[PDB]
Ligand binder design. Sequence first.
Ligand SMILES: CCCCCCCCCCCC(=O)O
Ligand SMILES: [Cl-]
Ligand SMILES: [Cl-]
Length: 174
Amino acid sequence: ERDCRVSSFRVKENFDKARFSGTWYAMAKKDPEGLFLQDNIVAEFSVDETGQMSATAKGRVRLLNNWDVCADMVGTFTDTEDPAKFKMKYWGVASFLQKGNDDHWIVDTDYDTYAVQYSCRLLNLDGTCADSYSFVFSRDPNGLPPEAQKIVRQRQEELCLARQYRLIVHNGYC
Ligand SMILES: CCCCCCCCCCCC(=O)O
Ligand SMILES: [Cl-]
Ligand SMILES: [Cl-]
């Protein structure tokens, strides 16, 4: 019944980069193929005078053969015609960390409590996403209040992802 075409997904009306700046703690993640950020994931958003949004992120990543390292990542956001949809160029402060360019959508936020982010890296031929990821962010590292949690669950369902998240732990690893 429900529409899972990426082209159908609503995103945050009149998204305000300035209001979104500051520290966001990842509470939950839906992983893409070949997942990178594992847990202890914290993002820092900024906007400069030209209106350009950028971010840094810290988190544990586990490169294969199970060697744990705290990745330090950088992202810069190129605007699109939709104020809530961006292209995010990202890299690690270390050369060998994963680099790339992903769609970065702010699906919903109230700026001071919760955010829902979404990226489809690759479409299916029917317009659904073949390879997606999504972060749920909280301003408070101890988690969302119930009213926000309930809104977020609705958005997770609208993205056709609600069954597919895992919780992100924060235990000072970094
Ligand atoms: C919120 C901006 C984060 C900086 C870009 C790093 C994001 C790349 C990792 C996301 C995909 C994954 O973690 O599997
Ligand atoms: Cl609930
Ligand atoms: Cl579920």
